[PDB]
Structure formats: C-alpha cells, structure tokens
Amino acid sequence: TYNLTSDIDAAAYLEELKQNPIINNKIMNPVGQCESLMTPVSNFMNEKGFDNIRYRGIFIWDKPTEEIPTNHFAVVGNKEGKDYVFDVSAHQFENRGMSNLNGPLILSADEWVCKYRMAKLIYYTDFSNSSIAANAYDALPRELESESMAGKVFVTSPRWFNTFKK
C-alpha cells in the first residue's frame, strides 16, 4: 500500500512542499519537526482550498509505566466533504518500531488511521489552534492511568491497555 492518496493530488502537493527548501530539509530530516511543520502545512492546505483545518495532537504509548509518551502532530482538512491528513513527518518513526511509516503521508483520514494501525497505544485529539494542540499533547511527564480519555480518539487499542484499564 501507499503513502500518498490519489483521491486528491497528493503527489503534486508533496512535490510543491518540497520546492520549499526549509520544508524539504524538514522532510529529509523529520525528527523533532512535526510541531514546527503545523503552521506551514496549514497555510499550504488553506491556500490549496482545504477548509475546516484542524491540528491533530497524537500520543504513542509503549507501556503503562512510560514516564513521557511519544508525541506527534499532523494537520487535517476538508476538501469536498472528505477529510485529509497531511502528516509529512510521519517517517520520523521509521527507525523507532514503526518501519511502515517510511515516508511523508498525505492520505484520507480513514487511510491515515489504517496506515498507523498497520504500523503501541495510539490516540489523538483534533484542535482548532496549533498551540492548543501542542500544549495538550506535550512532552512533559504524564501518568497514563490518570489521564482523561475524554475527547481522545483511539487509533489502536492494544490488549495490554484493555487489560491495564481492567
């Protein structure tokens, strides 16, 4: 399967993003970049005629006792009644036990979820503001057992977490 949907001109959009030398370097070297890419990717999408732009804050938990979960960020937008996710730094995880995330993704929302599932406990929340997203899905210590799952959307629900929660 694929990283770039044909439902929209994702291949063209990726090339256009990569014509920007700063974005090109961040796609070549994505580790630590998802947060800084939110604003530029949103601007890009808006100018392409996507609307209802949201900022997707994500956690990836390996185990219940992890002190700081792994975070990630993507941008979601509507085009003609369907949501698409631009996640051009997904491949920051290629070398961290998610080898299937082997390039930038521009996918429908359902394809995006599918991609992460085929690649740990993963959940997200969409926000209207990128700094709100960043704050809610930050890199400070958090205890999974006492996190509110209110407003969390599960991508995965591993057996360990269902057992953990009881």
Residue numbers in the entry: 145 to 263, 267 to 313
Question: What is the paper's account of this structure, in its own sentences?
Answer:
In this work, we were able to determine the domain organization of SseI and obtain a crystal structure of its catalytic C-­terminal domain (reductively methylated; residues 137–322) by SAD to 1.70 Å resolution. The overall structure and topology of the high-resolution (1.7 Å) SeMet-derivative structure revealed a single catalytic domain consisting of a core of six antiparallel β-sheets and eight surrounding helices. No density was observed for 12 residues at the N-terminus (137–144 and four vector-encoded residues), nine residues at the C-­terminus (314–322) or for residues 264–266 (a presumed disordered loop). The SeMet protein was purified using 10 mM DTT instead of 2 mM DTT to prevent Se oxidation, which may explain why it did not crystallize as a disulfide-linked dimer under these reducing conditions. It might also be the reason why seeding was not required to obtain large diffracting crystals of the SeMet protein. The higher resolution SeMet-derivative structure was used for all subsequent structural analyses. The SseI structure shows significant similarity to those of members of the cysteine protease superfamily, which allowed the identification of the catalytic triad: Cys178, His216 and Asp231. The measured Cys-to-His (3.5 Å) and His-to-Asp (2.8 and 3.4 Å) bond distances fit well to those expected for this type of catalytic triad. There is no room in this cavity for additional molecules and there are no other cavities from the surface that lead towards the active-site residues, making it likely that a small molecule such as water is involved in the catalytic mechanism of SseI. Looking at the region surrounding the active site, it is not obvious what type of substrate would be likely to bind, as there is both a positively charged and a negatively charged region on opposite sides of the solvent-accessible Cys178.
SseI is secreted into host cells by Salmonella and contributes to the establishment of systemic infections. SseI (also called SrfH) is an SPI-2-translocated protein that has been directly linked to systemic infection. The C-terminal domain (∼140–322) of SseI contains its catalytic function and shows some sequence similarity (19% identity over a 88-amino-acid stretch) to Pasteurella multocida toxin (PMT or ToxA), which causes atrophic rhinitis in swine. Based on its structural matches, SseI is a member of a particular subgroup (clan CA) of the cysteine protease superfamily.
